[PDB]
Amino acid sequence: SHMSASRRVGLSCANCQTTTTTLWRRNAEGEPVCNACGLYMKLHGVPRPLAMRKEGIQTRKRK
Numbered sequence: 391s392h393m394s395a396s397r398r399v400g401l402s403c404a405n406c407q408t409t410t411t412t413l414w415r416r417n418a419e420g421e422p423v424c425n426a427c428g429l430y431m432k433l434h435g436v437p438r439p440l441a442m443r444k445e446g447i448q449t450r451k452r453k
């Protein structure tokens with residue numbers, strides 16, 4: 391693995407963690423995602439799976 395610096399300039403995708411994209415779309419919660427992650431919800435409803443279906447947290451979080 392390469393030493394991936396946490397340098398996140400110009401937001402971060404609320405799924406795939408990439409800070410670089412052509413268009414910043416919004417997911418089901420309205421969070422700032424990359425174009426590729428936003429389209430996957432238009433196709434299905436869930437975003438592009440990386441770290442498994444773990445943090446679909448439902449603990450009354452309004453935001």
Ligand SMILES: [Zn+2]
Binds near residue numbers: 407
């Ligand atoms: Zn993304």
